[PDB]
Ligand binder design. Sequence first.
Ligand code: ADP
Lengths: 84, 155, 8, 133, 332, 375, 152, 26
Amino acid sequence: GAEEAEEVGVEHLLRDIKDTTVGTIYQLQDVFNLLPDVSLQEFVKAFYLKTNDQMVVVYLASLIRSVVALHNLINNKIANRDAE
Amino acid sequence: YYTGRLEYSEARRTMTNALRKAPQHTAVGFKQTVHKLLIVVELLLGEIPDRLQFRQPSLKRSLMPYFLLTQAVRTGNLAKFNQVLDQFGEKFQADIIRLRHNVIKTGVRMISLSYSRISLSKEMIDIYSTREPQLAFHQRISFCLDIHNMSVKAM
Amino acid sequence: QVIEYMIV
Amino acid sequence: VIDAFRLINANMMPRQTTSNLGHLNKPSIQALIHGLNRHYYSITINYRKNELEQKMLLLTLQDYSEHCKHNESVVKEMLELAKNYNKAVEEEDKMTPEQLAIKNVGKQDPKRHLEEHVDVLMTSNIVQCLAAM
Amino acid sequence: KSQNLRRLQAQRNELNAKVRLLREELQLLQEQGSYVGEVVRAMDKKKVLVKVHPEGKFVVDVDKNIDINDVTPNCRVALRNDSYTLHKILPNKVDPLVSLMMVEKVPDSTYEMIGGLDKQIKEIKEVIELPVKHPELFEALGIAQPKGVLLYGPPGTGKTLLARAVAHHTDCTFIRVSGSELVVRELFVMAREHAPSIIFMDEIDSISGGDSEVQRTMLELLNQLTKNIKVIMATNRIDILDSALLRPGRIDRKIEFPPPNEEARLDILKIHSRKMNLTRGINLRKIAELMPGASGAEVKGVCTEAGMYALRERRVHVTQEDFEMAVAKVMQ
Amino acid sequence: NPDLRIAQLRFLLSLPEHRGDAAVRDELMAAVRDNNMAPYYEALCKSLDWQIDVDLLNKMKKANEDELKRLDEELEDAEKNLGESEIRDAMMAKAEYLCRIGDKEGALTAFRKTYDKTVALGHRLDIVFYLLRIGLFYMDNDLITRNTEKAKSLIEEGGDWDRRNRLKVYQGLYCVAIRDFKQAAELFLDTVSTFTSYELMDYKTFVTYTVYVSMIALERPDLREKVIKGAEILEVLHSLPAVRQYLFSLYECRYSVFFQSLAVVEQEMKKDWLFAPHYRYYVREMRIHAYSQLLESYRSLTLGYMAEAFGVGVEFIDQELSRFIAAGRLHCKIDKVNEIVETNRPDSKNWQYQETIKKGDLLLNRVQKLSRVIN
Amino acid sequence: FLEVQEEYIKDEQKNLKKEFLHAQEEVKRIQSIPLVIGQFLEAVDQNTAIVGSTTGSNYYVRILSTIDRELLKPNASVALHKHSNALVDVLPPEAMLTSDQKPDVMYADIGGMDIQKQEVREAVELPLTHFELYKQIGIDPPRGVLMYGPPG
Amino acid sequence: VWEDNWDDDNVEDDFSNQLRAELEKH
Ligand SMILES: Nc1ncnc2c1ncn2[C@@H]1O[C@H](COP(=O)(O)OP(=O)(O)O)[C@@H](O)[C@H]1O
C-alpha cells in the first residue's frame, strides 16, 4: 500500500533514519523451462543493437546539458567578472 | 608539446593539450611546428581527408611540403610519394607501409582473383551495430561530458 | 559494461 | 498542528523553562488567537516511537512501444526547443536588462525545458536499461 | 586547503541563505496585501490624496524611502497595506490617451506606402512638419502660424492614412476625436501634455451639426493659443460643411484628393499587390485598365479578393486571372 | 545596383590565363571608363592586372569629387523646407553613390548612418537588401549572415511575399556558395524570380542554375518529377536546349550523352564566381549520383553493360569506381573475379553512426575549444 | 584543527540538502482549503505582483517561490490565500459551454443561402482547418465575422 | 565552401577524361 490522505501522520512519523535518507516439483519443473538464453545469433545481435541505440541517445543528451551547464559557467564568470 | 616531441596512441591527445597556448606567440620556433608536425604525426597513424585542407588557412606557415605529403598519402602511391620524399629531401623530420595500407583497405572485391592481384558474429560488413561494435564509440561522448564537469568546479 | 555503466 | 492547554478561566495569580519555552512567543500571533491564549497556555507536544515501526514505514518495458516512443518524443522537443534556446541566446545576448524582464513570466519557459528534458531520459534510458544488462 | 575550505563556506552559506528565506518565507506569507490605485497628487507635508480601486479616495502617507518629490499624478502605485502608507512605485500603467488610441485602435500605422500621391504629400508636408520641426523660418518670414488642414476627397483614397503617415514620420502623435462614445475640452490638456500633437476628425455624410461643432470648438481655443497642435478635418465634400468654416483663413490649407488615374492606381495596386505572392509575371496594367472611378479601398478590396480567388483552388500562387475575376466581380 | 555582371567580370579577369585580357577587358573598362570610380578600380587592377597609366583616373577622381562634393550640400541643404525624408534621400545620394564607389566603409558606414533617422520598412529592408547584395560582391560571409538576421526582421505587415521571394532568391544565391545545395534548389525552385526587372537574377542564368543545382540534393524520385513534369520551368528551358538535354539525360538513362552534357557544365563552371570546390565537388556528385543511379536497380552489374553507359571501356570505371568505394559513398565493388560488379544495400542505419562520430567529435571539440580557461 | 571542521562542512552541506528538499515542503500549507481565486495581471518584479482578486479590486501581493514563473499569463486565473491574499497556485481555465453536439440543423437544408454560406465557410472553418494556406499566399484570416441581418 | 574537398592529385577533369575517353575508345 500507499497510505492515502493520512500520510501526514506518517511523514511526521518518518524522522531519524528517514525514507531513503530523504535528501538522498511441478512448478520448479516449469521454472527452468524459461531460463536458457545464451543463443546470441539473433537475440545477441538484437541486444547489442538496442544498447547501441540507447547509448547514442545518452551521448546526444549528455551533450546539451553540458552545453547549458557551460552557459551557467559563462553566466557566473561574467557575473563575478563584473563584480571585480 | 615537448613531450609530444615512438608511439602514436596518445600523440593526438597531447595534440589537443599542445594546440592551446598561442594567441600571437612567435613566427619561428615555438608557435610554428607544433600544429603542422602534430598533424603530420596524425597522418603517421593514418587519418585522411576531412580535417586536413580547410584547416590549413589558419596558419599558412610556409605550407608546402607536409601538406603535399598528406595528399601524397591521401592518394597513396609510391610513384609520386617518391618525388615528395627524394626530390624534397630537406623537409626534415626523417624519423612507406602506411600509404600501402590505404589502397589495400579496398581490395578488388575481397580476396582479389584467387588471393592474387595488385591495385598499383555480425555477418554484415562493418557498417554500424546495436551491440559491442558501436558501444565503444558511444561511451566516448559520455566520457567527454563527465570530463567536462570540471566546468562546474570553476567560479 | 555494468561496471562501466559520475552523473550524480 | 497539535496543542493542549490549561484551566486559566480564572487564577491570574513556576518553571524556569529555559526562558518561557521558545515557540509560544512564536504562534500565529493573531488577536483573537492570543486573546484565546490568555485562557489557553499551551506547553509542548512530545513524541515517542520505536525502531520497529520506524523501519516498517521506511521491471522492463523495453521496446513495447516504450523506449522508442519516449526517445522518439523527447528528442523532437530537444530539436525545436533547442531552436527556441538558440533564439533565446541570440536575443538576450544584446539589449538585455532587469533580469530578462523578470524571467519571461510570459512564454515560459525556454532553456530550463531543455534541462528537464535532458534529465528525464538519463534517469530512464540508462538505468532500467542498465538492469537489462 | 583553507582557501578551498572558504569556497565550501561560500557554498554552505549560500544554501543556508536559501533555507533562511524559505523558512521565514513560510512564516512570512501570513501578513497582508497592499492595495493599488491612481491619485490626484499631493499638496502638503507628507501627503497623497489617493483614489484606490473599489472606492476611489483617501489621503495617505509615504515611507522615508520613497522620496515624495517624483511620485507624480496618474502614476498608480500603492502599499498602504493596513495603516495606509506608501512603499514604492510600479509600472506607470498607460496614461489616458494610450487608452483612446489602442482602444479606438482605428489608426493603423502607415508610412510612405501612399499609392501615388506626391503633390498631396508635398503640400501636407509643406504644412505639417515645417510648422513643427522648423519654426525658425516662420518667425522670420513674417508668417503668423499655419494650422488646420481640410482633406476633401472621395470616400477612400487619402483619408485616415495621409494624416496618419505624416503624423508619424514626424513622430508627433495622432489623437482622433472621431466619435464621442466613451470619455470636448479635456482632450486639449492631453494634447498640451504631449507637446506636439495632431487632432483628426470624421467625415460622415454617406459612404445636421455632426462634428463641425467640435471642429470650431477647438479652433476657438486653437486660434488664440502649447502651440504645435494641428487639427485635421477629413470630409467627403467641401460644400456640405458650415459657412463658419468658410472663413478664410480658418482652414489654412484645403488639400484636394482626386480619384486615382491610371498610373496612380497601378501604384496603389502595385503596393497592395506587393502584399502577397504572385507569379513569374503579372504586368499589372490590364487590371488598372478598368480603374475608371476606383477608390483607395476599391484597390485593397480587389487585391484581397484576388488572393482569396487564388485560395479557393488550394493554390499557392496568385495568378493573373484571379485579379480579373476580382475586379470583374466587384463591379457592384 | 552594385554590383552587376561586373562581379562576374571581376572574377573572370582575376581568374588565371584560362582567361585574361581581350574583350572581357573592354567591358570591364566600359564600367571603369563608365561610373567614374577610382576607389575600387585601382584596387581592381592592383591584382596582377594593370598599373598607372592615370589616363582615365584623373577625371575619374575629379568626377568622383564632383558628385561626391555636390551631394554634401543636400545633407546641408535639407533643413530649409526639407524633412527627414530629404536628409534620408541626401544620405541616398551619399548611399547609392558611395555604394557604387565599392568601398566597404563608404557604403557600410553610410547604411548604419541611414539606419538612424529612418522611416518604416520601405527602408529598413530596402537597404539591408542593398547591403546584402554588395556583400555578395565582396563575399564577406559575416556581412551576409548579419544581413540575414537583420533581414529576418520583416514582421511589418512584412508578410510581403513578393519580398520574401527576393530574400529567398538571395538565400538561394548565397547558399549555393557555402556548399548548402539542399537549401539552394528548393528556394530557387519554388520562387519563379522577379526583382526590379530581374537585374540581380540576371536571367538566362536562373532556371539553368536551378536545373543544374537540383540533382545534387533534390532527391531523384521525389521532386525531380516536380522538376520534369512541373510546367513552370520546362517551357523556359525550351529555349535553353543544352541544359534541357542535360536534364532529360538522367531519368532517360541515355548516359552516352549525359557525360557529354556534364562536360558542358564543366566548361560553363568557368563563369560563376562561386567557383572552385563547387565545380570539382559538383562534377564529383553528378558523377557519383550518376553511377549510383545505375547500379542500384541491379543485384549484379556486368562489365559490358557498365561499359555501355558511355563506351569508356574498363579502366575509367575501374579506377574511378574504386576511388568512389575508397570513399565508400556507393555500395558497389570492382569484382574483377568475374568482371561483374555486385550490389546489395546495407541501409542508412549505419549512415548515422558513421556520420555522427565525426559530427559528435566536431561538436565537442568546439566546446573543447571553448570550455577551458579561455571563455 | 582545520581538518576537523573540514568534516563539518561536508556533513552540513549534506544535511542542509536533507532539510532543504525537505524545506520546500513546509511552504505547501498556505495552499489549503479554502483559498480565494482571482486572476493574475501584470508582473512587476521578483516574488511580488498586482494580482486581481474576484472580490472587486485588484491589489498587490507577494507570490511564493515554489510556483514557477511559467504559467502566469496576464489573464491566468490564480489562487490567493484567505485573510492574507498571497498567491499560491495557477489553475486550469475554469469558467460557458463547449456545446458538445447539441445544435442540429444541417447545412444542406439551410435553403437558398449560398454566397453567405461560402463566405462564412470561407472565413471561419476553412482558416481553422487550412490554417497555413493563408500562410502560403499572404492574406490573413479575417479575425471576426459580423453578421447583420434584417429582419433575420 | 567549408566542407572538406579532395582537390588533390587528380589530373584534368571529366572534360579531358571525357575527351581521351571517347577518343581512346574510337
Ligand atoms: N493612395 C493610397 N495608398 C494606399 N492605400 C490607399 C490609398 N487610397 C486608399 N487607400 C486605402 O484606403 C484605406 C484607408 O482608408 P481611408 O482612405 O482613410 O478612408 P477614406 O477613403 O474614407 O479616407 C487603406 O486600407 C488603404 O489601402
